[PDB]
Every structure is written in structure tokens, then in C-alpha cells.
Symmetry: C4
Subunit: 476 residues, 4 copies
């Protein structure tokens, strides 16, 4: 009858394990190709990560070197967020960095070279006058910028006036070859570094903020002869094969989803002819697999990210920002679908189901508590904002005070209070104590309670019955 032929069709359709689709008929495809995509996208990613980590592992190191070469009185180990005050000493930095640039072949150990050359930038106001003692100023909302050009060879001349001075900057390129990357592996060895020292006077507070910033561009050498004999990049293959596995599993997943929707509306109609039951929300949403939706999102994202990787490796742009993010979130989604395949196995399916049933209420409670904690933020930002250093901008309030829910670096935040106004000090202790109490002895225990109860209910389900369903009646 039409009824049992459904029972055959939808029971075998809905049988969770493709192990059962294996156990009648002969087909093993949909899991095999998807494990292929797992190992493919993860080897893709890991390979990407090691290459990019070599580029970075050279960049941070050279930036360290340049910091100790061009920054006067920079301790051989390190310093951080450097600062200057007296004017002649700013002059001594600038003169020092210049004389270090010109003599760098004598000075430096590293092989960095001029490229076949410096330059100097000053940004000053169109019209300065400021009389801080007379209570009278005029301000210009315009900056005129003047430059020099100082040559690699052939003591200095220069001019500076602080009051009109907004920022001073040094820009130039040092070009260096990375032995250990090209030598063993096939990656480009040529680096164009743009070094910029910059002095921020924008605060006009007396602090001249010094930073040495490093921009980096990759190039391949015109002639490389190693071992006395005559790089070759094969990634050109495996990126492509990734894009193909991804196109394929995308097509298949989408096809199965659409078939499931056609059988969705078909089933609705059939149940209308016979029993005239509707229930299109619950059962319509049952017919959605919901995991193949993840596999589609992941799969689109690996297509886009693999394409961007292929184009950036083609032009050698080296931003590697958007590409990396896409590739990483996609592979994380794949590794999350492995839980899917663990659902069939035997026992894990309980524990997975209860993670699945807890998440939709968990997010709800996250809304509720988000209002509390978002409330404290606007409190302590304004009350403690002038006094505490870790409450400064709202963001630091939120990310610090969230680190304080998890109970980390807490004695710090208690210990660093200014204690000038005694009232704000006391408030600080009521604020911090009360809040930490509220999150650690309520809200954490509310997640524990919520999830515990969810877990026992799905344990009862797997022990005795499941909620009555039109579909379940009619398949059995």
C-alpha cells in the first residue's frame, strides 16, 4: 500500500547510520569522500600553517634586530613601548638612528643591505600659535609635510620645532635573504623590509612615543645557484585537488538536501490526503538534515579560502589575513562534523544528543546573563575608569572583568586601586566582591543545573521512549 512503501522509504531514509544504508544495498560513498575531505582540508591547512610560521618566524626575529640597532639605549634583551621626554634626547635618538643607518655595513651582523636611499618625514601644522601661559591659542586643522632624502654614504643637519610638530617619521628599505627557508624547502628567500621609526607627538603631553614598525614583502631571487647546480612550488596541485574535493562534496550534500525537501513537502501532502495532519514546522524541520548544512557552510568556505590562497600565492601579496581566517574557521567546522560521525558509533550518541539539547537553552540563558554583565560594564567603566588601569575603555572593562569571572589575575585588580577618593575605593570593593560572587556562585551553577537536568531527560528518553511523533508512528 502507499503506507508501507513509505515505511520502507522514510525508515531507510532517516536511519541515522549510513552503516545501515551499507547493511542493505551496497553503497559506501557519502562517508568515504567526506573523510577524504577531512584529511584533505586539514593537510591543506597544516601545510599552510607551517609555511606561514616560517615567514613570521623570520619577521619577528629581524624586527628584534632592527629594534636593537636603531633605538638608542634599547637594552639588549628588550624594552617595551619606549618613551622620551627631554628635547635634546629626542635629537639624540634621531641623530643616532641616522648614524646607525649610514654605518650599518660596519655595524650590523645581519646581512641586510641598501637597495639600489633613506628618506625623512616631518608633519607640521600650517599655522601654529599656542600661548599656554596667556590662555590663548590658534589651531590649524591642516598639516604641511616636509621631507628630506639622506644617502647611504657621504654628522647631520636637520631642523625641528616641537610645538608645530605632530609626528616625525623615518622610512626606508633594508633587503635581506633568508638562508634556512629556501635552502631546505621551496619558498621565496627574498625580503623587502620597510622599516619605519615613528615619533607620535599627537598627545602633545610631553611624551614623544617611539615605535619601530616592520613591513615585509616576499620575492623570489633572480639567480639562485645552490650546491653549484641549478625554486619549484608544487602547492599548485594540492590546492587544486582541495578545491575539487570541495566542489564534489558540495554538489552531493546539496543534492541530498534538496531531495530531502522534495520528500518533505511530498510527505506533508500525502499525510493531508490520508489523515489531514499539518505539523509542518516540527516535521518540516525534521526533514532538514542539519549537519549537511554545516558541511555546506564549511565547504563553501574552503572553496573561497582555497581560491584566495591560490591567488595570493600567485601574486605573492602576503597579507594572508582574510584567507587564513576563512580556511581556519572552515576546517574547524569539519573537525566539528567528526562529532557527527561519532554519533553513529554506539554510546556517544547520548552525550552528543544532550550537548545538542543543552545548547539551545544555553544560548537563551546567555542572553539573560549578558544583560547583567553588560550592566556591570557600564558601571565600573565610569566609576573605576579614572582610577583602575585595567578599566580604561569599555572593552578592557569587559575583557578584564570576563577574565575575572573565570577567576584569573584577580588579586591584581584588587591590589591596584588608586585609593585617592576613599568613597570610590570602597565602591570598588563592593563592585568587585559582589560581582565575582554573583557570577561564580550563581550563573556557573545555573549552567551546571541546566545542563545536568537536560542530560537526565535525554537519558530517560534513550532508556524509555521518545516524544510521540507522527513520523515515528508511521515508520513503525
Amino acid at each position: 500500500l502507499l503506507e508501507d512503501q513509505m515505511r520502507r522509504k522514510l525508515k531507510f531514509f532517516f536511519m541515522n547510520p549510513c552503516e545501515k544504508f551499507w547493511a542493505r544495498g551496497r553503497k559506501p560513498w557519502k562517508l568515504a569522500i567526506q573523510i577524504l575531505k577531512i584529511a584533505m582540508v586539514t593537510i591543506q591547512l597544516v601545510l599552510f600553517g607551517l609555511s606561514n610560521q616560517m615567514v613570521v618566524a623570520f619577521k619577528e626575529e629581524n624586527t628584534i634586530a632592527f629594534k636593537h640597532l636603531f633605538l638608542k639605549g634599547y637594552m639588549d634583551r628588550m624594552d617595551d613601548t619606549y618613551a622620551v621626554y627631554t628635547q635634546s634626547d629626542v635629537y639624540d635618538q634621531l641623530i643616532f638612528a641616522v648614524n646607525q643607518y649610514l654605518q650599518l655595513y660596519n655595524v650590523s651582523v645581519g646581512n641586510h643591505a641598501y637597495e639600489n636611499a633613506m628618506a625623512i618625514c616631518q608633519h607640521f601644522y600650517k599655522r601654529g600659535n599656542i600661548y599656554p601661559g596667556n590662555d590663548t591659542f590658534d589651531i590649524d586643522p591642516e598639516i604641511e609635510t616636509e621631507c628630506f632624502f639622506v644617502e647611504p654614504d657621504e654628522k647631520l643637519n636637520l631642523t625641528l620645532d616641537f610645538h608645530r610638530l605632530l609626528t616625525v617619521e623615518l622610512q626606508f628599505k633594508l633587503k635581506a635573504i633568508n638562508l634556512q627557508t629556501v635552502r631546505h624547502q621551496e619558498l621565496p628567500d627574498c625580503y623587502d623590509f620597510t622599516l619605519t621609526i615613528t615619533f607620535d607627538n599627537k598627545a602633545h603631553s610631553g611624551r614623544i612615543k617611539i615605535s619601530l614598525d616592520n613591513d615585509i614583502s616576499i620575492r623570489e631571487c633572480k639567480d639562485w645557484h645552490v650546491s653549484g647546480s641549478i625554486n619549484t612550488h608544487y602547492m599548485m596541485i594540492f590546492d587544486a585537488f582541495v578545491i575539487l574535493t570541495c566542489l564534489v562534496s558540495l554538489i552531493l550534500c546539496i543534492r541530498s538536501v534538496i531531495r530531502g525537501l522534495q520528500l518533505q513537502q511530498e510527505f506533508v501532502n500525502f499525510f493531508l490526503l490520508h489523515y489531514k495532519k499539518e505539523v509542518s514546522v516540527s516535521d518540516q524541520m525534521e526533514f532538514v538534515n542539519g549537519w549537511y548544512i554545516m558541511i555546506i557552510i564549511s565547504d563553501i568556505l574552503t572553496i573561497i579560502g582555497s581560491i584566495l590562497k591560490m591567488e595570493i600565492q600567485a601574486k605573492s601579496l602576503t597579507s594572508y589575513d582574510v584567507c587564513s581566517i576563512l580556511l581556519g574557521t572552515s576546517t574547524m567546522l569539519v573537525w566539528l562534523g567528526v562529532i557527527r560521525y561519532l554519533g553513529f558509533f554506539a554510546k556517544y550518541n547520548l552525550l552528543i544528543l544532550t550537548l545538542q539539547a543543552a545548547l539551545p537553552n544555553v544560548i537563551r540563558f546567555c542572553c539573560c546573563a549578558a544583560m547583567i554583565y553588560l550592566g556591570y560594564c557600564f558601571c565600573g567603566w565610569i566609576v573605576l575608569g579614572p582610577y583602575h588601569d585595567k578599566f580604561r575603555s569599555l572593552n578592557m572593562v569587559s575583557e578584564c572583568l570576563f577574565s575575572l569571572i573565570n577567576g584569573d589575575d584577580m588579586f591584581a585588580t584588587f591590589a591596584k586601586m588608586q585609593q585617592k577618593s576613599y568613597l570610590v575605593w570602597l565602591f570598588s570593593r563592593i563592585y568587585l566582591y559582589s560581582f565575582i560572587s554573583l557570577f561564580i556562585y550563581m550563573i556557573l551553577s545555573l549552567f551546571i543545573a541546566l545542563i545536568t537536568d537536560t542530560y537526565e531527560t535525554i537519558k530517560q528518553y534513550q532508556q524509555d521512549g521518545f516524544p510521540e511523533t507522527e513520523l515515528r508512528t508511521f515508520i513503525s
Copy 2:
């Protein structure tokens, strides 16, 4: 009959959602105006916070500058809680700070200026004699204070004798204009800094404690001409409109509360004529909304805080202490009432109800455990007080050892024990180990147990019935 006309009245009165008051009749007021107050009080606050954060962001920076200008041998990065020992070196600080004051136009990068000028304070005893080798002293409970006045222009003379010397102090004003605040935004640019270096000899221990303290006052410039053409503060509006929204929602909430109380005592009397039941505590407290009480507290507090903000911005006092606290706690209460509006929505009402039912027992247990932990405090303060540095005053004992319940910076407090008396060392390990065990493996699990059980009981309630109530009988 009088009975059903109640059932109509009190059922519609008590219907939790104003969504239902919407669904019969036509009125949407009480929620609309209150969301207005939400966005109003939070934009009020956030705006306040960004302005005040600009003032502070300039203050801390200039204080850094002055610290590195007037403190001899203050490392360009920073030092902390500075100290001096040899007497000639105290002289070298003082002479140094003076010669740095007089030459500061040559020296400093910042634009700070004398105001159209120094002064020097010495606080010495009326009669000193102390013979620490003879075992004999006489002490004076009186301080005579002598000052100098040193001019901005035109090497030094001065006198100091340590034994009679209680504190030395330098006070003076540097006046500076903040470009980046006035320039983009409408806020005052003029700062009067009172710099005070102070040397605390009060301990008479040999340590001369140096600090450089910064007092700051805001003023508007007499003539500001920017861009070659001719600040204006609009906050004058939005503060007022806040005070109005607050007055309005205050009046409305109070009115509804009072009506609810009149229907309270009315209902009591009516149930006396008919069935003669009393139960005035349970049901009398039912008639209290209890959320509008929060909205009143919040609303009064935003009235007071907005008024203080308006007056301080009027006179430009800049304490911004009491005002900020009021405004922040008020807005935190508003953000806490958003949970109220989340109670109607659908499912959250469970989870909210169980937070509500857990809090009243949670506070009880907080009493009980507060006695334990308050007991340990008086223990470790005296036993470990001489030895540990973080147990010093009782307060540090309580705030450290509370940071130790949450399990932070613990290996520190174990590792820093003096270990001179071996008995106190051993006690230290029994103390710390035992206490940390007791709070993390009992009391945290007691909050978890308490709240879990509360949550399951209100889950049963929402599943099957609620406690029998006179009101509930008579509305249904």
C-alpha cells in the same frame, strides 16, 4: 457578581505580560516609555564615560611626563613607589627638582608653562630632641611649618635637618592646553596642574618616601581661534531630557504601585466579608510588583546623578566622584530590569524564576559561610601577619584570601613564606591547604547543590501546578 468582576479585574491586573494588556484594550505605554529610558540613561552614561575618559587619558599621560622630569634617576619607562636613603642624595633630588623647574622651558618637550612662581614647604617639630643612643628623648606634638618662594627665573640655597623633619614638600602649578580634545570635540582645553612632590619621613625609619602627585582643574580658554575663524556645549539639552524621562517614569511607576496597594487592602477587606481569610503577609506582598520598586530606585538615582552632573558641568568642579557612582549604579539597575522584559518573552521565565528563588536562600548561606571565612581572616592575620607580605592589614588578608578561593595567584602565597620560625611555616601550610580545600570542595559545591535543587523544583512547578493560593483559586 462581585466575585467574577474581581476575576476580570485581578486576572487582567496580574497578567504578567503587558503583551496581554495589549491584546485587550489598546494601550502600549508602560513598556515603550521604559525602553526610552533604557536607551536614554545608557546614552547619557556612555557619553559621560567617553568625555571623562578623555580628561583622564590626558591626566595620566602628563603625570607620567612630570614624573620623568622632576624625579632624578627615574628610568625612562617607569619606576614605582620610589625611595631614598643617604642624606646627600635626598639633597640631590631636591636640588635636581629645583634646577629642573627653573630650566623647564629649555628642557621639556611638553608645552607646559609657568602661570603669571614656585613655593617650598618644610614641616618641622616645635622642639626636637632625640637621643637614641642615650635611651632618652623628648617629643613635641606640634609642627611649625616654614616655606620659601623660588622664582621662575634668576644654583640654590636651602636648609634641612632630618631629625626634626617630618615631611618636605614642593607645590606649584604648570598650565597646559590639550590640543586633541578641544580641537575635534567640544570640551575645555585648559588645564591647571598642581604638582606636589612630597617626601614622607613620618616613619622615621631611614626611608624617605618620594611621591609626585598631580591635581588637575579644567578651564575654558578666553580666546580660541581655530581654522582662522571663530566652545559650544550642547549637553545642556540631553541632560535635561534625561531628567524629564526620569521624572515621568517615576510618576507613572509610583502611581501604579499606589493603585496596587489600594486594591491590596480592598481585596483583603472583600475576602473578609465573604470568606474571612486574612493571609495579609503572603498576598499583601504578592500585590507589590517588586520590579517597579527597582525602577523607582533606579529612577530617583538617575535624577540625583543627572542633577549633580548638570551642576558639576555648570561650575566645572571635576571631582566627578559621587555623581559618577550614582549614575553608574542607576544604569546598572536599568540593565537589570531588561531581565524583567525578558521574563514575558517565552522560555526564559523558568530560568529567571529560579534565579529569583535561589537568591533568597543563597544570601542565607552567604551568612553562614561568611562566619567561617571571617574566622580564618582573624586567624591568618595574626599568625601569618609578620611573615607573609600579602597578609598585612586584615583587609589584604580578606581580599587576598578571597582571591585564593577563586584559585588565583596561589603558588605565590605558598611560595613567599619567610620560613624563619619553622612552626609558623608548618602552620601556614595547614592553614592554606585546609582552607582552600574547604571552600573549593565544600562551599562551591553547596551553592551548586542549592541552586540545582531550586531549579528542578521550579521546573516541576512550571510543568505541574503552582502552590495553592487564595488569589489563584479565585481568579480561575
Copy 3:
């Protein structure tokens, strides 16, 4: 009958609240005097703590001063666990400390004085010969000690040979008066400091370990004249009244306990004549109050500690070690009995009862897990002991790795591995990962489960019935 007259007697005896003993008859004694003892022993303790904290607050400060005076190249802020290597530099420390001693009236700011004077100690072997290049030595298990005496007034001579040198030491007394203690409060102002610099060569490793140690003795000044007119210690009273309140509550508690035991064996016999039931363990232990046992322990301990305080304050010894411990643990026990008084109140009695029922199983599980964790200790001590710095002696293994259960300073212990032998590195990661997993995802959840279940069972008890008891039958 004999039966109901028991029911009268034992029901009123066992009625938990003395509120009920109040509600029939007229007596309020046993709680009133005990609250007296609460406030008495805690004011006793707190007063002790503030005085002792003044003594310490001066000691640590002066020790800081001396450290910066007598230790060459000791940064004005601080250094820690100082060290020396080259021999001429050890000489430069010693010569420096001497020339700093002799000139200290010129040098130092603090008022410390010679007392109406130095001395120098050298500890050398009876017979040294060590030939580390010849592989041959002879060792003497005897030390001969030679001293000098260097005068406060009137460049140096001295002799040192490192190989025979075990330790060098400088001992002497500086005598100083503390203004701020005597002046406001009644405490002695005279301090005898014994300063000892010591150089530990015991390791014979090339590191000469320098430390400056401070011994301190309190004395009262012979003539103190303050304000031009003519300390007085009243503690002589309040210590005594403490000892009296303690004797009194001790006598009363013991008396009630003994009466309870006489009615214990009486009841056993009476139930033998009538029903011939034994059950002497359960009910015999019921007749023990069990809280008055705490009050006795506390009370004895406050007697001993108050006596030791009175004697030490009499002789002014200032060890303040054993005394402090006794006084502090006693007062902690009192503050723990306040939970007792919270048991009667109303609702807390549930939560208290479940703490009481959980503790006896909690200790059991503590045994079980103590075997695991004590096992890991003997593992990581030997495997990681040479490599990690925080696993050194077993104790540091146990107190660090316990800090690691609570999840603190963890990334440190992962990050500091030597990584010389790769096998020990890998083992280190299996060790740390596995252990941290085991305690945080098992044993903490086992305490949570144990206590939760205990709490629900006593909740059922207070809801419906208690275990059948001979006593409970026969009182009702």
C-alpha cells in the same frame, strides 16, 4: 509514670533552641555569656593584631633601609637573594659594609645609633687541603672560628682564604626609637636591632650567598618627656577579664556535658529495665552535645594563649609565635560556633545539617584521592625534578601541583621545561595533561556529586520524617 517524666525531661533537654528553654521557665544564661566570649576573644585578638602589626610595620621598613645601606650595588627599589662571584668583589662588599658602618652618622638619614662596637666572624676548617685537579683532597669535620672587633670610630685590614672558608659573618647592634608608636599609643619605642650580614660559602660552588638578617628586641625608654610633661599599659586588665570569661564558660560547658553523660548512662539503664534495648553507640553519641566540645577546645586554647600573651607582654620577649597561633586558632573555633547559633534561627538549619552530613564522607574521599595525588608527587619529583624548577624538593612538587589542581600559574609550569632530553619533555606533557584532566574533570565533580546527593537526602528528611530512633519514639 517514669516514662512521661522522661518525655518531659529529655524532650526539654534535647530541644535544640535555648529559645525554647527560654519559652518555658525564665533562664537566658548560656547564650548570653557565650556571645560575651565571642566579642571578648575577638576584641582581644584584633587588639593584639594591630599592636603586633605596628611592631612588624616598623621592622620590615628598617630592614629595607639597612639592606640598602650595607649592601653594595643594591638597587634603590630592591633586589632579591643577592649573589657574588669574583673574589675581589666579595672583598669589595666586605670593605664597603665596614666603611658604611663607620661613617653611618654622616651617611644615613635614619636616627640609628651605636650602642654604648662591631665584631666580625670567620668560620674556617681545622685543616684544609683540596686538590680538585689532582683528584685528591682531605676534609676536616671541624671548624675553628676567628673574630675581630672593629670600633665605631678611628680603610681596613683583614684576611680571607676561600677554600678553607665556610661562612663569613658580620654581627652588630643598631639602636633606634620609633616615634609614631609611642607617640600616639602606649607601646614601647626602643628597638635593639641585631644586624647580621652573612656570606654562605657552604655550597662551595663559586656562589657566595649574601643575606642581611634583622633580629629585633623591644624595650621601654628610661626617660620619655613628651609635650614638655610626663608609658602606661592597660592591657593588664582586659587580658585578665578574657581569662575570667574563659574560665567561666569552660566550667559551665563542662558541667552541662557531664550532666548529659550521667543522663546518658541513666537512660541506658532505664531502657534496660523496661524494654531492654542497648544501642549504646548511636544514642550514647547522641547524648554528647558535640558543640560544647568545640567550645571547650576553644576555651582551653584561649586560656593558654591569653596566659602566654600575658607573660610575653610581662617580660617583653617578642617571639610572639606560639602565643599568636593558639590565640588565632581558638578565635577561629569561636567564629565557627556562631554557625551553631545560626542553626536555631530558622531555615539555615537545613544547610548546616548537610554541611555536617557531608564532611564525614568528604574526609573519606579525601583519603582515597590523597593516595592518587600523593602518587603523582613521587612520580613527577623524580622524573621532572632535574628539569623543572618548581619540582625540586617533594614539598614544592606537592604545593605547586596542588596549586595546579585549582588551576593557577599553569602555563608557567608547561612553559619552563628544559627540553634537553626529548623523552622527559614528552613524559612531562603526558604527566601534566593527564593529571590536570583527572583532578578537574573527576575528583572535583565527585565532591560536587557527593555533596549534592547528601543535600537532597537531608532535604527529604526535613520534609518527611527522620530515621526511626528509640529516643524519638519515646519523647513523642
Copy 4:
């Protein structure tokens, strides 16, 4: 009948406590010898640990000394992972270390001696040419190594060219005797230190990485005469007796296991003749003791580790790596079997049983969550890898981010983001926030729920019945 004679046999076989095997018949062996093995293997281990800790306690100290002697500008306290930049300064290190080697008898306090002598290593390329400015290089995959030999006695000559220079190295031996070890205890006093300074130029980045590494070999002195009269190692005994106790308990445990297996298959057959039930998996695995399996593993491992200890102490090799690991994991297994003996006692058996029933599901969930967290790792490694310092290699990602589940050093990882690309910054906050939320408010609560429920189920079992078993029927 054959049936009751089983019931006698298997009931007494399976009676958990050997207390019951005591209570009929007379034998106490199997527990007595095993407690012997407990105290034996733990005294073995602890003794090992104290000896090895003396060796290490001398090694780290001397390494400190040498670091401060041979490293120019190494602060007397310490520095870490030292670095150099300018070429003449590398020369100044090298010249300095040489002049410190030659003069070390004058210089150093420690007794270290030349052994009856330096050497110097340079590793340079076979053919260098690198033109970083011309974009052209040739690389040699070959290193030619040249050495000098510099004498202990009798300013320097040397040659260095950086571009061909891969590493420079100094190797030599200082020989020192440890007084405090031989003197009190019987251990060898002679140390051969191999000191190697090494300069890593491999990065060719401009950073010359300096390290001072210490290799150490133990020897016994040819002539030691102490106290004027004439070491002796007894460990030769107790190691052997350990190996014997271990052989014995191994033989016994294995014998009982094999007997249990023979009665296993016997019982299967007997139940086949009578009732013809199979159930060989459940009951076959019941007949395995499962604890004696642990005791065998432990016992084999103590045999191997004691043997390796005996051989290393024989030859005095001092690696002490594999040996230590074996000995430590074995003794940890023994200390874990003490839980076994706690199972019989009385009440602990519940709590033990539930640890035992929770572990097999716990590992399952560990698989599931391992997929998630292993997914995040491959995400944040690539996205945050260039920017964060603690995400560098994948391993640091995993061990840091695991330290972040437990909630430690979190505000660090939030605070150190580069913030160059704003998109990667934002992603960083979604990554970190989301992940920390997911593990602390889900997966920890899922372990809590899982274990709680397991605990209540075994509580019901011990209260009422156990699952029906063929064996249990037929023993009762």
C-alpha cells in the same frame, strides 16, 4: 552436588576482601607481601630522589656560577636567553670569555680547576657568496669546521667572518669537587664539567644567540682522607632486595591470574553441561581480577627500572632518564593500588566503584570534546599565529589554550594582541570569548552531569540489588 561445591568454591574465590579468606582458613599472605612491596618500592624511589636531587642541586648552582663568569655583562642576579647584535660586541664576548678562562684561578671563588687545555670551534660554509643587494646568492650545503687549541697559561689572536659563519663554539672541561655530598653521605664527589658556550647564527637574522650549556659526569676520588683517617655504597643491597620482592609478587600474582582463567573456562564448560549458557564476554571478563593486572605492570616496570638503576649506578653513567621514568610510573601504579586495599574497608567501596564506572564513559566524552578543541587549535594557530606570541607552533597553541580552559593567565592572552589588522583582532576576540565560554559553561558541566548521574546509579545499586548475573544467581 557439583552445584553447591561450586557455590562454596566461587563464592569464596570472588569474596572481595581477603579479610574473608582470613576469616575462614588461616592464610594472610597476599596483602602482607604487597604492603611490603609498597613500602619497599616507595623507599627505593624516595632514596633515589634525594640522591639525584643532590647531584642536580649542585649542577644548577655551578651552571649559574659559570654563566656569570664567562658571559660579559650578565647581571649578577641573572638574565635569560641572551642576545648580541653589533659585530665588535660579539668579538668582545669571545675575547672576554677567553681572558676569563685564562685568569680564572685569580678571578673565581669556586675551586674549579683545569684538568691535566681549552679548544675553539668554528663552523663555516664550504663556499659562501651572498649578494642580498644584487638579489643573487650561491649557497653551499656543506660545512667545513676549523678549530684552535688555547693553553691554560701563556691577549689573543683569532679570525671571524660572519656571512660564512654558521655557529661558533667554545668547549672545555672544569673539574670540581663537591664537599657537602661526599662529606656527610656516601656519593661520589668528583665532577667533570664540560662547558660549551655556543653562538647560533643559523637564523642569519642579525641575532647571535648566546647560550652557556653544562654537561656533567660523576667520578669517585682516588684518594679521599677525611678526619685524618680512611666511599662505601650500600645501595648494592636494597636495590637487590627490591628486585626480589618484585620477582616474588610477580610470580604470585601471575599464578593466581592463571588459576582464575582455568576456573574461567572450566565454569563456562560446566554451565554448558547443565544450563547451556554462554555469556563468555561478560563473565570471562568478570573472572579477570583486573587489579593484579596493574600489579603485574607495576611489578615488571619496577624490575626493569631497578635493573637499569643498578647498572647505571654500576657504571656511573648519570643519564638517569629512562630509569627514572620507569621507576616513577611504576611506584605511581603501586600507590594507585592502595585504593584497591581501601575498597574492602567499609564505605569507600561506593565512591571507588563510581570512579570505576565513570572513567569508561569519561574517556568516551574525552574523545568527543578532543575533536572540538583539536579543531580550535588548527583554527587559532593559523589565524592568530603571526600576531599572538603564545600561538606560535601548534603545540603552544594547544598547551596555552588548554591552560585557558582551566582559566589561568587569561587576561595576558587577551591583552597581547598585535592589533595591526583590525579584522584579525576582532576574530581574536570572537575566537577566545566563544571558546572559553564553550568549555567552561558546557564541557565542564557535562563531566559534572555524567559523573553525578553515574554516582547516583551505583548508589541505588548498593542500596537495592545489582544487575542480574548468572554467577550471582548460582553463588547464592
